Scaffold this active site. Structure first.
Site, short mmCIF file in Angstrom:
data_model
loop_
_atom_site.label_atom_id
_atom_site.label_comp_id
_atom_site.label_asym_id
_atom_site.label_seq_id
_atom_site.Cartn_x
_atom_site.Cartn_y
_atom_site.Cartn_z
N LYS A 1 -0.91 -7.31 10.06
CA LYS A 1 -1.97 -6.55 9.42
C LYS A 1 -3.04 -6.12 10.42
CE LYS A 1 -2.48 -7.91 5.42
NZ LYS A 1 -2.79 -8.65 4.16
N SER B 1 -2.38 -3.26 -4.02
CA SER B 1 -1.25 -3.80 -4.75
C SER B 1 -1.35 -3.46 -6.23
CB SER B 1 -1.15 -5.31 -4.56
OG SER B 1 -0.06 -5.62 -3.73
N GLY B 2 -0.18 -3.30 -6.86
CA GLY B 2 -0.11 -2.91 -8.25
C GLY B 2 1.09 -3.46 -8.99
N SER C 1 -5.18 4.43 -6.96
CA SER C 1 -3.81 4.02 -6.67
C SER C 1 -2.92 4.35 -7.86
CB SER C 1 -3.77 2.52 -6.34
OG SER C 1 -2.45 2.05 -6.15
N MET D 1 4.93 6.16 -11.90
CA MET D 1 4.94 6.26 -13.35
C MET D 1 3.54 6.51 -13.91
SD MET D 1 7.58 3.60 -15.34
CE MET D 1 6.15 2.64 -15.82
N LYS E 1 -3.99 0.49 -14.91
CA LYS E 1 -4.43 1.70 -14.22
C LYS E 1 -5.30 2.56 -15.12
CE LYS E 1 -0.37 2.01 -11.13
NZ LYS E 1 0.78 2.80 -10.56
N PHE F 1 9.84 5.47 -5.70
CA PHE F 1 9.83 5.24 -4.26
C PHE F 1 11.26 5.18 -3.73
CE2 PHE F 1 5.45 3.19 -3.32
CZ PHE F 1 4.88 4.42 -3.58
N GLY G 1 17.00 -6.54 -6.54
CA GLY G 1 17.08 -7.63 -5.58
C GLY G 1 17.60 -7.27 -4.21
#
Ligand SMILES: NC(=O)C1=CN([C@@H]2O[C@H](COP(=O)(O)OP(=O)(O)OC[C@H]3O[C@@H](n4cnc5c(N)ncnc54)[C@H](OP(=O)(O)O)[C@@H]3O)[C@@H](O)[C@H]2O)C=CC1
Ligand SMILES: NC(=O)C1=CN([C@@H]2O[C@H](COP(=O)(O)OP(=O)(O)OC[C@H]3O[C@@H](n4cnc5c(N)ncnc54)[C@H](OP(=O)(O)O)[C@@H]3O)[C@@H](O)[C@H]2O)C=CC1
Ligand SMILES: COc1cc(C[C@@H](CO)[C@H](CO)Cc2ccc(O)c(OC)c2)ccc1O
Ligand SMILES: COc1cc(C[C@@H](CO)[C@H](CO)Cc2ccc(O)c(OC)c2)ccc1O
Lengths: 290, 288
Positions: A43, A83-84, A111, A115, A124, A146, A158
């Site tokens: 990061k 993040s979501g 963000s 969808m 959201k 994505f 997975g």
């Protein structure tokens, strides 16, 4: 002479592209450097790799409200991308409170990148509804899956790499989904955040040729490798359980078609609004995996 | 015309730098693609950003022997770069190299304090490589600059402090600071270099042999300000679990990274004068 942008969430998946695409556009790009959460070295170098490309760094904690006031006053436009997968996204309420107190913001792009929450098929919309309240000009960038999370794995769960033997098909695989290279999302978001045509509007990212059903994406892979996969059809209920990494999401995209059911106009479709973006077709995207 | 390097630990901190450098040098470079631990965007893309430069991936699992075997059979030199449990999976790799034996050299995972000095499980691994007849080279000697320079050898941070500072001892012990990219380029050059086969290659670039006090002052000059300094001595520095604080001791109090010198015939900066390593004055300009 530029539009100075601040990219909140600049080190994340979608975030780091937007930093990069902002700079490419020609923007005095700005990234938020947050009170370090541990010894996170990916990061940190991700962060400092931006100032070589042109970017600047602003210090701010979400705990420290006037820090966020200081942050947003230095910029013309904030774009968020936290993040979501959801109490992460709701941090955006604090960012809105600070942008409202500052008032120099010209447009705020929360963000979204996916969808449309406004339909029925998260929290959201809670964030949309605060923006509109304080009256902050906005632009909602929505409507794509994505590529890394849905096309490269042939929508299999997975995993993120092509399967070699066997592919699950949800329904008949004849629901039409929108698969898009996240690089092109960012470019659209970077071209769109100062456009006069998309202020206060929702921007749909539906590159035509990348409007595809599953089984069509799967025949893009099979035609590449030259091998027919062993396909197993999965019906709605056999897909309903009552957990696993987001199923309520898949189901709406791949069974209900919530992404391609309502068609959209050129005056609001990324590829049409920005025809110069030569985005990526999945026949090229999947090429890295052969 | 060139050796085939098969990096192992290719998306780790050192590994990605090694992958990039093996390609930079010009090795047909191979990365080891290991079954998904998870849905890891940053591991998967990192691996696939390599192909786009010229690197090939190889799928092999450590719960599978001829998998490892099959991939080593494909390369001249293997260079692992792991994280501790993680260091002792290289034995399973040593049994494949040995069982394949097409290998001309194997640079294990080191790049840190040489553990030969008493004052680990890398020795465990050395004794294995060796007892198997594997040509080798042990890249050793470097303090990682992102882990000990940018923070100015402060703990819990990776970026300069602003007013206060924490000094270990008199701050006049010498420590070998090195930016990870030079280690890797030193690693790319040594792995096929006749002169280092079956040696330990050292990386102590002369100009970057400094002391904390000398490092804090390289910065102090970059900012134009001085930093309220707090000096910590031995006995106060030894606690009774915090991120291997024996490493910070041996290195900053005992001097173990420096208490011996190394023939120029074993020193990376002498073997490789062409690598214009980075001086901590340059590596630090980025946080300004
Ligand atoms: N198919 C699709 O369309 C996909 C859409 N999405 C959505 O796209 C948007 C981008 O999200 P995404 O990239 O996936 O998020 P990530 O999980 O990848 O997080 C990336 C960045 O988000 C910030 N972040 C994460 N957690 C926190 C936290 N507790 N506090 C503060 N910041 C945090 C950080 O930015 P920083 O360190 O700078 O503060 C982090 O670096 C979201 O709305 C997401 O839900 C998600 C998955 C797939
Ligand atoms: N100051 C100094 O000089 C320092 C020295 N070092 C040394 O550098 C070398 C590289 O470490 P570094 O890159 O920095 O840190 P990392 O531990 O983060 O390396 C991560 C990579 O190692 C692999 N990995 C992690 N766990 C496992 C596991 N159980 N099994 C197999 N592979 C695993 C993975 O490679 P993949 O998934 O691609 O297969 C992973 O991507 C180490 O030997 C270390 O001793 C490191 C810290 C500081
Ligand atoms: C289309 O728009 C969105 C899409 C999403 C997708 C999320 C759902 O939690 C996850 C990734 O974060 C997708 C995922 C889940 C499990 C998997 O096994 C998987 O295979 C890689 C991929 C979230 C928000 C959106 O607005
Ligand atoms: C130089 O020699 C070596 C050094 C190391 C460093 C290791 C020691 O555990 C750790 C990460 O694993 C780094 C670390 C420790 C404490 C910290 O406060 C810290 O913050 C940045 C980072 C390993 C192997 C070596 O041969």
């Amino acid at each position: 002479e530029k539009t100075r942008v601040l990219v909140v969430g600049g080190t994340g998946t979608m975030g780091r592209r937007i930093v990069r695409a902002c700079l490419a556009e020609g923007h005095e790009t700005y990234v938020l450097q947050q009170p370090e959460t541990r010894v996170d070295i990916e990061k940190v170098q991700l962060l400092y790799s931006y100032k070589r490309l042109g970017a600047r760094l602003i210090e701010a904690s979400f705990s420290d409200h006037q820090s966020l006031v200081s942050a947003v006053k230095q910029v013309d436009i904030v774009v968020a991308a936290m993040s979501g997968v959801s109490h992460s996204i709701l941090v955006q309420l604090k960012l809105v409170e600070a942008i409202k107190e500052a008032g120099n913001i010209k447009r705020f792009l929360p963000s979204e990148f996916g969808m449309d929450p406004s339909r029925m098929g998260d929290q959201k919309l809670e964030v949309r509804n605060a923006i509109e309240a304080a009256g902050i000009p906005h632009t909602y960038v929505v409507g794509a899956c994505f590529a890394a999370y849905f096309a490269g794995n042939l929508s299999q769960m997975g995993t993120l790499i092509p399967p070699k033997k066997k592919v699950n098909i949800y329904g008949d695989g004849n629901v039409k989904v929108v698969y898009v290279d996240e690089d092109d999302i960012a470019e659209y978001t970077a071209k769109t955040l100062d456009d006069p045509r998309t202020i206060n509007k929702t921007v749909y990212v539906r590159p035509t040729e990348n409007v595809l059903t599953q089984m069509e994406l799967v025949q893009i892979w099979e035609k590449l490798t030259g091998k027919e996969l062993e396909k197993t059809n999965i019906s709605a209920n056999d897909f309903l359980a009552d957990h696993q990494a987001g199923l309520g999401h898949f189901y709406h995209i791949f069974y209900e078609g919530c992404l391609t059911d309502h068609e959209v106009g050129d005056d609001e479709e990324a590829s049409k609004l920005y025809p110069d973006v030569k985005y990526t077709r999945m026949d090229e995207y999947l090429k890295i995996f052969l």
